[PDB]
Design a protein around this ligand. Structure first.
Ligand SMILES: O=c1[nH]cnc2c1ncn2[C@@H]1O[C@H](COP(=O)(O)O)[C@@H](O)[C@H]1O
Ligand SMILES: O=c1[nH]cnc2c1ncn2[C@@H]1O[C@H](COP(=O)(O)O)[C@@H](O)[C@H]1O
Ligand SMILES: OC[C@H]1O[C@H](O)[C@H](O)[C@@H](O)[C@@H]1O
Ligand SMILES: OC[C@H]1O[C@H](O)[C@H](O)[C@@H](O)[C@@H]1O
Lengths: 830, 830
């Protein structure tokens, strides 16, 4: 059937009776009233049964051996569905496929019923999810820590071509994967004041919110390792949230509990954009506060909570603990670690600081100013009074370090300050993370260089040893084996299965680049993938596409820096050229653009409306026929990505050079048989460097050209004046050609493009359409297109998150990865 | 061990491995980190496994046979713990006791870990729970319908002698008994307006709240019948509760969902008191609206949703459906049934009314005015516009019926109106229930007569056939076998086990009233029970009591009509007599008073403080010694009742004659070996009539004497003037003898007792202490006390809820009870 494992006789029979056990005892249903949703749950429960045994021994193991623990703090974990991924990592897919088949059910139909765990916005949240899988696969004693939002990223609905947002009630039917652990509930404090008495400061008169943990298993790939992702939920204490007496109402007091519990109610839907709301800050401290108590409790036991030097010596803390900060969101971990060590454990400042800097490491994901977290001091002052005091003290001592290093450099002093003066005083969270971490890394080579040359230049000059790079990567399990079994199978037919956990082996496919059968096969799976997607399209969304055309797809969050608009300009250009010479042959294209816009991002929502507006015109022009279709992919999310990426021919990574930190979707397309048209931005540089620039479609300005233009001054009018095709498009938008009933509908876009384009869309236009002509030329030659595809796939090995994690482990965490199978799952009951 | 069933070889082994399966696969724990709470859950899950098989066939059976369905609507269901009760009804107790023992655990210790399902206030909510058990035991196709509150009756804490209320988060750790059924979610409407168009009225522009059901199994006693209790939970739709666009905030929209969901957040803690708040009314319509759709859906299928006359003829509706109204709380079921039939199904008014009156029946539980539900018309007008219209129309036609029956009786017309004029117009819910129900019943003989003679006299004259009586009862399973196995065992030793489901057989115990061994045994179990309680007291609450003293206990909700105050006066009298003649012998007594006061009931909370105040003085007077102790039983609830009742010697049922509708605690004490001191009120009359007045301690005014006094005019001063002992007590309270630091602390109580005593406490004082002297005299003669106890127990058979339910079934629902064992639980999978 494929290498989805063995469909053993004993195990298919075992699976079947357990499926029935759950359908009866767990779901309390009988075959006669069971719906596909019930069947999905019986299977999910049956599959989950297979990893609890491994989950329990993995955790018991770490307790016995007591290795260095890796804690990955993130406010986002973009998990997606977890049924197939668990089957794949446990080598259960074929057995389950067989068993359900015998039960008379279609496993694929049941898989579609599982709701996505959308606890993420985009790139940052998915990275965390890929990292978790790789850390388990590499046998690291790692823990994912975050917030269990009851409402994840909103479900996007397109009404009249406009995005409509609606609550993502992913828990509505229950989550069979998580395990509530109410017995490990921890208290978290807010507000209060600081009392300075005799021997130390005291955080007093605080409001208490409880953090209840929920553990979700994270299985490694076929190694019997099941790590844990612990997600905190907010709960109100039953005392003060009722007991603070003297009138108000008993009923109202109980109803008011949903004020402390709102902390974990919903994920902020912002991608690369900072919103300084109090609710956000509370979520940030809530995950940090609860997680640290857990980390310290685990350490206090270790082998110190037995003997060792005997005396809670936190000197070995950094040798047993490593906490990685996914962006500055969990940055309060630094002053919170200090608060506990100093105020509670009573260590001296310097010893505590040494310990803190040694266990914390920070990861930066963007260079755009509006994405940077700068919290107003009055907020920190009211909500976390002691943390502000600790931050001021950290700043004081850090700046003294700078003064001592750069005598007389008074401007450098204000530039590096953690405290920003001006309208309102703010705390620069990124400066905080650099100061309190022993390592700071970028997510791609050029982004990491940019950090040292620009944004964090002063900090780099102060401590050059802190700055590193760790190029992002994706997990080949979910992003290849799971979503593209057809391609995984033909690769395995030639080079084996060891590449799934050693992606570098794909290089061996280079010797099949002239193999006639392979070329035919690589081409065949892509055709099969396109056919399946084209079908899904009509199934769930309804209104035909042509599977013989070039599948041009750009899927990511809607942003001005990602330039979906530049893509739009090209689409309109194609349309106008066809209308000029209708009877001329052009390569057919289905351009698919999908992604979510943050609810308050006006420009982004206007761009979604433009895309659907273009589709309304292009898709109903009889002269165009089936040569050009414009489709907007609704509700782009992880599970939808698993469907489009394998069916894509062209991947669009066209951000303005210097703006996309790394990107990971680009990697997803490369490993799945799509050719890439993009700018020398983020990881695109390392990808083209790996496949060879000849097998990549690079165009536009490089970082240097962008800066040259900025020195000069960017004037869009110049481009409008010298390019008639561009002029024609802008006047079409301006006159209502794409919006008849509302002719001035797109004035904001035109106005922006002409007067305030921060990402110079027009400057790359000419080279972009020129370059697009070149991919069309190559698509006309199926054999050469596929051969170039093979060159990309065979050379994508470097972009596996296993490589990324191995580097973090060695160069930052100080732990060694291991592909050693844990001692089976085998029963056991001590 | 006892007749807690057989501890079979095959089943104890089967239980044990399943206990381990759950501890591993369900709880995801290993013996080395498992706590008693984990052990309780493994057992609970193991026990629950035994009734799902029976649950599924019982429901499938009712679908095949299609009998008349009984729907018990109540806003309260006081369930308590459900682990032991399930073991008892499934004959699993000994096997589970053995198995856990072999596993090295104490089953009794694990049972104490289960949280009570306190979805009730007192008498009314517990009746519903006893009814459910009896309906299952008598094989009726009955369904319990209500609201799944996430916070039940508050946990009572005594601080400085004052009650403190704190949220009852009973779901904190999960509920292993319920089964969420999100697939049967139903919409409920609120607000909107009424459009009158061409062919009918339309309820439009409403706000939608979703009702998600949760089913809990209700097993009959050893007959393999497992009925269902469906509890609704409020959920917000993900559309409009987000989709009603045009600014406000995406985040705020999501946080605002907890506004529609507040509907099922908390139970109103009022006992026999009406609070006209909007939240209450919304809960009342919410349970009614969701339940009726479910009832009609089930009917539409039946055998009509196959063939029959073919044409949705609702003429057979009353032949297939019976809905019982537990008080006026679910009274909107009447106008809601009309709304659906008329507005949606399009039946003519008269046919719909006929159907409605024929399927609905109402139960009245109290005669005090402040307990009566009178909803302001402006509230109904805004929240349920169409229902108000239907109510006005019902009133119109009903009053025409009256005018026609009593020509010219203009006052009778205003008296009977469903609409009350005055300050604000109100709708009298009770009048609504009488008009739209084919039966109206009281809960005890005297209460039912009072309804006909007083409160509902006019309605009785109009339709005498509607009014009935159904004396309350309690379930002998939870209230005997479960809480007092020792007494159940010795009864079974002489007359067998058939009495558990045929309590009348206890009469056979009358022939052992002179049996020396039985008397010794009856006396022994009571002594063992007292010893166990006296121990629990020191275990969980701490500060000694004497098990040789007479256990004088009054446990019920704190009310002015229950007269805990009259009990207080007696306690103080005993104390004063001892202090007058210290070296005189008096029968030792431990008087225990327990119960909760509604949060806003000032007088009730003042009474709790008086009780603890008396204890502070009495319990620390060296001259009193161990002859008199005053203890306040904290957090009185179902599980605590199972502990005190079996250990009680004297039961206090001293409400003012004519105020306690029936009472059920009185019955609980009678079946468990306690003698009763009380007034000729409620069921006390039927109990004394059953045991013989010679075996009952009756005192005070009868209903007639109370009325005579009211004609005359009640003057408390007269009693104060002629009784020196009474005078001495009031001056003690007035001068601060019981409150030194705050001498005027009890001025409200004294003031009330002297000038506004609605329940004439002083009028019964003399006869009450005189009567108390008589029980002390009899306690001094152990043999005669026990013989009288045997006369009570042997004669309590009439007070089983099986008898009550059999009467409802025959005289109201039109169904026949059946003690037929359903065809085993046996596997099966169609
Ligand atoms: O005190 C202990 N004794 C025995 N095993 C323990 C103890 N603490 C943790 N463990 C084991 O380690 C796993 C890790 O628990 P953690 O504290 O949540 O990391 C547990 O589920 C147990 O198997
Ligand atoms: O349409 C039907 N076909 C077969 N069995 C049904 C059907 N509707 C109800 N049942 C059975 O009746 C039980 C009662 O379901 P209810 O509608 O919730 O009362 C179900 O769990 C099924 O066993
Ligand atoms: O590092 C993970 C991702 O984080 C953010 O989404 C960045 O915009 C993206 O370039 C990066 O790939
Ligand atoms: O009918 C059930 C119970 O309802 C109420 O609590 C009444 O006050 C009580 O007398 C009655 O026994």
């Amino acid at each position: 059937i494929s290498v989805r494992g063995l469909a053993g006789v004993e195990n298919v029979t075992e699976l079947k009776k357990n499926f029935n056990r759950h359908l009866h005892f767990t779901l309390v249903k009988d075959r006669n009233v069971a719906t596909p949703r019930d069947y999905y749950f019986a299977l999910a429960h049956t599959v989950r049964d297979h990893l609890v045994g491994r989950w329990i021994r993995t955790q018991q193991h770490y307790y016995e051996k007591d290795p260095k623990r890796i804690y990955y703090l993130s406010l986002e974990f973009y998990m997606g569905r977890t049924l197939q991924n668990t089957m794949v990592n446990l080598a259960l897919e074929n057995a389950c496929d067989e068993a359900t088949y015998q039960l008379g059910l279609d496993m694929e139909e049941l898989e579609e019923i599982e709701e996505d765990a959308g606890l993420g916005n985009g790139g940052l949240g998915r990275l965390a999810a890929c990292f978790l899988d790789s850390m388990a696969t590499l046998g690291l004693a790692a823990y994912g820590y975050g917030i269990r939002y009851e409402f994840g990223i909103f479900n996007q609905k397109i009404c009249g071509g406009w995005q409509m947002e609606e609550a993502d009630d992913w828990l509505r039917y229950g989550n069979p994967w998580e395990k509530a652990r109410p017995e490990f509930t921890l208290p978290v404090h807010f507000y209060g004041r600081v009392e300075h008495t005799s021997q130390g400061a005291k955080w007093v008169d605080t409001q208490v919110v409880l953090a209840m943990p929920y553990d979700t298993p994270v299985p490694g790939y076929r190694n019997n390792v099941v790590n844990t992702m612990r997600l905190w939920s907010a709960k109100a204490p039953n005392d003060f949230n009722l007991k603070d007496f003297n009138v108000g109402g008993y009923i109202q007091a109980v109803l008011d509990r949903n004020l402390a519990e709102n902390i974990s109610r919903v994920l902020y839907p912002n991608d690369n954009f900072f919103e300084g709301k109090e609710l956000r800050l509370k979520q940030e401290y809530f995950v940090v506060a609860a997680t640290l108590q857990d980390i310290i409790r685990r350490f206090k036991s270790s082998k110190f909570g037995c003997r060792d030097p005997v005396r809670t010596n936190f000197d070995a803390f950094p040798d047993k603990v490593a906490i990685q900060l996914n962006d500055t969101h969990p940055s309060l971990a630094i002053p919170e670690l200090m608060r506990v060590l100093v105020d509670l454990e009573r260590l001296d400042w310097d010893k505590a600081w040494e310990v803190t800097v040694k266990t914390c490491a920070y990861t930066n994901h963007t260079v755009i100013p509006e994405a940077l977290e700068r919290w107003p001091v009055h907020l920190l002052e009211t909500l976390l009074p002691r943390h502000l005091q600790i931050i001021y003290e950290i700043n004081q001592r850090f700046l003294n370090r700078v003064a001592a290093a750069f005598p007389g450099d008074v401007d450098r002093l204000r530039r590096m300050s953690l405290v920003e003066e001006g309208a309102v005083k703010r705390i620069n969270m990124a400066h905080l993370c650099i100061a309190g971490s022993h390592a700071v890394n970028g997510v791609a080579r050029i982004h990491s260089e940019i950090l040292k040359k620009t944004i964090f230049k002063d900090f780099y000059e102060l401590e050059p040893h802190k700055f590193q790079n760790k190029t992002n990567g994706i997990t080949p399990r979910r992003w290849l084996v799971l979503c593209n079994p057809g391609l995984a199978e033909i690769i395995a037919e030639r080079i084996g299965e060891e590449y799934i956990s050693d992606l570098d082996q794909l290089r061996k496919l280079l010797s099949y680049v002239d193999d006639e059968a392979f070329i035919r096969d690589v081409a065949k799976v892509k055709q099969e993938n396109k056919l399946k997607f084209a079908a899904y399209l009509e199934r769930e969304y309804k209104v035909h596409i042509n599977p013989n055309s070039l599948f041009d797809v750009q899927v990511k969050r809607i942003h001005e820096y990602k330039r979906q608009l530049l893509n739009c300009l090209h689409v309109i250009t194609l349309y106008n050229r066809i209308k000029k010479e209708p009877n001329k042959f052009v390569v057919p294209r289905t351009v698919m653009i999908g992604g979510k816009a943050a609810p308050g991002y006006h420009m982004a929502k206007m761009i979604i409306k433009l895309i659907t507006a273009i589709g309304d015109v292009v898709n109903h022009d009889p002269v165009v026929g089936d040569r050009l279709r414009v489709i907007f992919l609704e509700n782009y999310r992880v599970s939808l990505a698993e469907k489009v990426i394998p069916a894509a021919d062209l991947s669009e990574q066209i951000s303005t050079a210097g703006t996309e930190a790394s990107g990971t979707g680009n990697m997803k397309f490369m490993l799945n048989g799509a050719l890439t048209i993009g700018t020398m931005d983020g990881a695109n540089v390392e990808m083209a460097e790996e496949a060879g620039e000849e097998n990549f479609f690079i165009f536009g300005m490089r970082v240097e050209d962008v800066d040259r233009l900025d020195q000069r001054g960017y004037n869009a009018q110049e481009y409008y004046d010298r390019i008639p095709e561009l002029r024609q498009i802008i006047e079409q938008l301006s006159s209502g050609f794409f919006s008849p009933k509302q002719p001035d509908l797109f004035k904001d876009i035109v106005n922006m493009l002409m007067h305030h384009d921060r990402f110079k869309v027009f400057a790359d236009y000419e080279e972009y359409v020129k370059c697009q002509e070149r991919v069309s030329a190559l698509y006309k030659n199926p054999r050469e297109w596929t051969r170039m595809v093979i060159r990309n796939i065979a050379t994508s090995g470097k972009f596996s998150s296993d490589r990324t994690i191995a580097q973090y482990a060695r160069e930052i965490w100080g732990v060694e990865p291991s592909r050693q199978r844990l001692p089976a799952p085998d029963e056991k009951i001590p």
